[model samples]
Target: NLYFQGMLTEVSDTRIAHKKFGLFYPSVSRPSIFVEGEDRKNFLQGIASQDILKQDEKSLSYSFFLNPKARILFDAWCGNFEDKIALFPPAGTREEFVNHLKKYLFFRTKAKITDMSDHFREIRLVGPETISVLLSLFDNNFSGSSFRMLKNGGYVLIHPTSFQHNLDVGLQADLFIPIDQFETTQKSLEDFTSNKGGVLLDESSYLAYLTEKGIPLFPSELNDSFFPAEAGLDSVGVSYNKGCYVGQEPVTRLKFQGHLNRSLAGFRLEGPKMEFPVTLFNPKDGNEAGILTRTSSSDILGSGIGLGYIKRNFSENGTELLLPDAQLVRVHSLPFV
Candidate 1:
């Protein structure tokens, strides 16, 4: 089993400002699930939130797997490779994900599922110069676009546009390399970093970076308790024209209705308070208005940042919110930098 080995205890303040970096995400959270057979595309098209029929082998796209009730079961980055479809679900959820697929796999179904998470490693490159760092290593002309495949074996999955502003490197992409090639890949990365400085960021800093960018964590900002529209996922994860997915009915209804009672928002805490599931109130009226779902202190921002669901009326930018302690904080548009 792989162990939790972090790169640094904390991200250095200097690196946060000036240096480019890469993170090696543990396999447990970055597992690859393979769906193959003549029926692969059809199955995915019918089940996932993305228009799987539109995906080509060279591109990756984000999608959600929702229950019949239109609540999120899990999310994935799906892509095609040759004849099969690869579903990259967040690590630690592979087994549950596999079972989830099996529940829909009737005997007549032509799809087959395989867990390939153990055979690869995920390396995320970051910073304003991230593309340069990647070009330096591969030397193959890359399009500087998210989800485009490299000439080499690995695929490229870039950070979302919402979070690109704070990256001094200006781009972030996850590189998936096979286990046997990891040593060679590591050597190449080290050699490139030696000439063009970059650091291997630790887990804590990685989490902070994500929070600062307003990227929600799975089961934290994303879970069965929430709908896609509520977390602002529909903007990136859902396809309305796509026909007949499990949760399509309700999701589409929400789209037609064009509103929700509560939606996700970003928060900046005035002081550190390491407590959670805390109910937020409208300080003006004392009624419950929201709840803090996920939070972390950012070395870059020098403040506590969090993602939470707030009543839609109060979800607008610059809206003031109150914690149980009566401490006041303001809502900001995501990518909190």
Candidate 2:
């Protein structure tokens, strides 16, 4: 079993169970929604945001253009094509723990968290947008939280368990909460979702990218608004630096910020490949359901895999689905990338 530990109970369940998986905690009283797109500099922070000026810095955050492409990492892990994380001594050997995390990663280094006053490992990945960068550090005890610096201007403390932690363990992230002057000082963040492009995957997003030419695409409903939760955005849609934003306020009010009524994820069928962008439905209730974001049939499992948004109840490992033309979508947990 993929063992995971986390702070929010529902988040833990969703992580292991969701196909397009990653982990993140919503900031306080802030809706940790995603605005989608590849121009990390534009989609994440404003064009004038500090991330651009700091892009060349030895240590700085990078933006990812296509979320689904990155989601493939989780799919690979779930598919058993990848290796399990190596375990290290529980105590007295900090260096060993650092090396273990660095193994599966392409690049890694150590960094000092001056704000939290903690030291951690930094892992980096290459992406179509900005380079994929992460800060990682683990101990034998595994008693820490994960943070993802957002395009906006803050870090969202993510509950690691949501990536694969046991909910009962009480592992949670505190930094996701927005506070003091977050809304007032960062009013410029409202324009963060202004432009788009750099979509490495997804037909629609890619089509949009090609159509845009030099035009910028925004990852919002107004531009392409659907439920942010349905886009599998919560995982990396963080503001690691700020206080709060709109819509996310009620999310903080409810403790389960990770638990959305809906979620963005992927699925597969046991037989023949699905056409592009197949219509997803609820086999149980016979109700109109979700839209497949991406689809593939060429895999070791021989099942069709797709990414899209689904209602919470249908997102389970064994949930059943019905297609638009009367097809059954056996709810198989995604074979993680």
Candidate 3:
């Protein structure tokens, strides 16, 4: 598995400048694109791992594209807008993602894909209070999971994120608003969230928030270095019954075989360690048991927290282990909020 070495550095800050509700533009590049045509849905049905056929304008499903080997190339949220389809590729992988789509895009296939990254502005409002703030914007308390089209024509995706955020649980809202209305919309959004004590976080601060919130990012946790399941993506990025798509074979094979050699999980360390991407040891037998990809201090956890892949034996909840320094490390379930 690919490991990353970095520090969130400020997990304990909840100041308005670093608070839980605001327009948090992530540091990753999101190349907004639309696949339009009568056959657009069909085209992606053959490409994404999620069941595209199951998605409608009111419903969205998580999907991932895999290399032929069933290893994830990129994971996307799938949505059908009746007139067009949207595929949100993993962060910073727009170029190769488009090329991969074009490779299978037959001229005969009635679909046309266009990159509209420049035409729209994506504002991501993240943090613990994000869900409550966004809920105030809409009157519809509709049931069931799906995306929403705002009265102003902005497309909004509300991923019901659990685990960490203020007030215990929260959501991540990604908005794609038309360029012409960007300024006005952004202005109102800032006013709206600011009224609720949310502040606009710069890219760097947002990255810190993500780590504190226990969410993964591209070229870090959500990269080609690990399989979707190994990255803890099986719940949100893999489909067990979807028809054939790129990289479906290995995914199904692994599913039927049951379990991976290692899996991503959270850890509570004895102290805040500076060096990571280091081998974690199981003191029981003194075996090399896992790898710590990233570590950061979190106020909620009241200690240093880590994200890494642990061998299954030592990965169970409350399993104890050790760091390279022979200090104590405790394995815990995710959502270190």
What TM-scores do the predictions have?
0.87, 0.36, 0.82
Model with the higher TM-score, candidate 1 or 3: 1
Candidate 2 off by > 4 Å? 1-56, 60-223, 227-229, 244-259, 270-277, 335-337
Which candidate gets the maximum TM-score versus the true structure?
1
Candidate 1 global lDDT: 0.73
Candidate 3's displacement at residue 52, Å, is 0.5
Model 1 agreement with the true structure over 201-243: per-residue lDDT tens digits:
6666666766666776687878899898887778678899988
Which segments of model 1 are wrong by more than 4 Å? 1-19, 143-154, 159-170, 272-275
lDDT of 2 at 274: 48
Q: Superpose all Cα atoms of candidate 1 onto the true structure and report the RMSD in Å to 1 decimal.
A: 5.9
Tell me each candidate's RMSD, in Å, in order.
5.9, 20.6, 5.0
Which residue pairs come into collision in candidate 1? 28-91, 29-91, 127-169, 127-170, 128-168, 128-169, 128-170, 129-169
Query: lDDT by residue for model 3 over 99-192, one digit each (tens)?
Result: 9899989878989988777676788876656666667765565322457767777677776453221112345778777779878877777778
lDDT over C-alpha atoms for residue 273 of model 2: 48
Residue 301, candidate 3: how far off, in angstroms?
2.0
Summed over model 3, clashes come to 2
